[PDB]
Amino acid sequence: TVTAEERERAINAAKTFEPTNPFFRVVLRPSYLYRGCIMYLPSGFAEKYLSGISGFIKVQLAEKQWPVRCLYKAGRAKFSQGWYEFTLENNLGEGDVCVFELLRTRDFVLKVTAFRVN
Numbered sequence: 001t002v003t004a005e006e007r008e009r010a011i012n013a014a015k016t017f018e019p020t021n022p023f024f025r026v027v028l029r030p031s032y033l034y035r036g037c038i039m040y041l042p043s044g045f046a047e048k049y050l051s052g053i054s055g056f057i058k059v060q061l062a063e064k065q066w067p068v069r070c071l072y073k074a075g076r077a078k079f080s081q082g083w084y085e086f087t088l089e090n091n092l093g094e095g096d097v098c099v100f101e102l103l104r105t106r107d108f109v110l111k112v113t114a115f116r117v118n
């Protein structure tokens, strides 16, 4: 069981972290956490940094990388294929808070730091 206090704690820890690279934060919720699901990235961040992002990008957690399809189309960036599997293989669940930062690499790499509830 996840308590309300744990949720508040994890969100506060995530909010304290301020990467030097461009970043956004997202609290994982159930509609993002099942096989075949999608997840839209924040629209402002997507417009500023992810125009022309296409195809399988690298999502990195603890120096391991997962392929996640990220398509920017009709004004929104959407994760699809590979996103759920990234969360499952990293034992991420609802309430965990992920900070995604855009690394200074040739291709698109989003590095995740997870602030886990339990």
Ligand SMILES: [Cl-]
Pocket: 007, 027
């Ligand atoms: Cl919440």
Ligand SMILES: [Cl-]
Pocket: 054, 055, 056, 069, 070, 071
């Ligand atoms: Cl694509």
